[PDB]
């Protein structure tokens, strides 16, 4: 339903913000240097490098998901935000009415001028001697 879709959007937003914050905080925490005990410097360093790269990838993925959320929200607004549909419909209607009225005024003035010319031509043609 509409409620269900809006809830789902809320869930996605909360999840994305939470993920960006958590990944950044975890990267900062690993960035701490600590004294080693039973971790074998080389292994500890490679594991830390992998963790940082994976977390950065996760942050980028969360940003892409936030872009997807913004796109979905834009689609919902363009499709069913009733006020803006009403202002678009009304503006379209008023513009088309003004164009119709301009066309009809042009046609009516054309008819009157053509009618006066027709009167002159009728007098000339019917009163021709031949």
């Amino acid at each position: 339903s509409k409620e269900t879709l809006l809830q789902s959007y809320n869930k996605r937003l909360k999840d994305d913000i939470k993920s960006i914050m958590d990944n950044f905080t975890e990267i900062i925490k690993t960035a701490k240097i600590e004294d080693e005990t039973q971790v074998s410097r080389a292994t500890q360093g490679e594991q830390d490098n992998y963790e940082m790269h994976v977390r950065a990838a996760n942050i980028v993925r969360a940003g892409e998901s936030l872009m997807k959320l913004v796109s979905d929200l834009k689609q919902f607004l363009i499709l069913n935000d009733f006020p803006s549909v009403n202002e678009a419909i009304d503006q379209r209607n008023q513009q088309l009415r003004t164009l119709q009225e301009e066309c009809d005024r042009k046609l009516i003035t054309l008819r009157d001028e053509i009618s006066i010319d027709l009167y002159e031509l009728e007098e000339e043609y019917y009163s021709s001697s031949s």
Partner: protein, 191 residues
């Protein structure tokens, strides 16, 4: 035959009103709103019975040449046939403009006047009226008036034949399409 009126009623605070109207312009038929302005006055006949007869008379002040309107509303049916709407018996009568004078001869006396100013939409058979009730003081004058409350009233009404089910369910669905903005419900006329 005897036609019945199905009513759902509610109210809406005025500062949210426009959103309601915009919502209604989506859901109701492809029309501009109507902006009715009516004068309503209630006559009663103090007969022998404990219940005096009641009659409602409306003159549409805004539109010239609109016929006056009489309405008799029967007492609501206690039967649970349509459980979700006020089901009443309605007799609605278009009339000439000497009506009040005629009703003064019939034994009827006035009770109260009120202006009602608002908008009017429809959806199929349904009639949505969103109006503000204006108390008249200085009882002859129609200009000396004061708003009764801050809220507008919203009525969803269907006049149709006696019985005739699957009507109140459609009114339920159309009320539920408004349910964040308005709460429409069958409110009993008692208290």
């Amino acid at each position: 035959i005897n036609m019945m009126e199905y009513l759902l009623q509610g109210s809406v605070l005025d500062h949210s009103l426009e959103s309601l109207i915009h919502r209604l312009r989506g859901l109701c038929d492809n029309m501009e709103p109507e902006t009715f302005l009516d004068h309503e006055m209630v006559f009663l006949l103090k007969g022998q019975q404990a219940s005096p007869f009641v009659l409602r008379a409306r003159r549409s002040m805004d539109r010239a040449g609109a016929p006056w309107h009489l309405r008799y509303l029967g007492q609501p049916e206690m039967g649970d046939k349509n459980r979700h709407a006020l089901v009443r018996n309605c007799v609605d009568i278009a009339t000439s403009e000497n009506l009040t004078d005629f009703l003064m001869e019939m034994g009827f006396r006035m009770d109260h006047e009120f202006v009602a100013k608002g908008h009017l939409f429809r959806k199929g058979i349904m009639k949505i009226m969103v109006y503000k009730i204006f108390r008249i003081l200085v009882p002859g004058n129609t200009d000396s008036t004061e708003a009764l409350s801050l809220s507008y009233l919203v009525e969803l009404s269907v006049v149709a034949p006696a019985g005739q089910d699957m009507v109140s369910d459609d009114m339920k669905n159309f009320a539920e399409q408004l349910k964040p903005l308005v709460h429409l419900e069958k409110i009993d006329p008692k208290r």
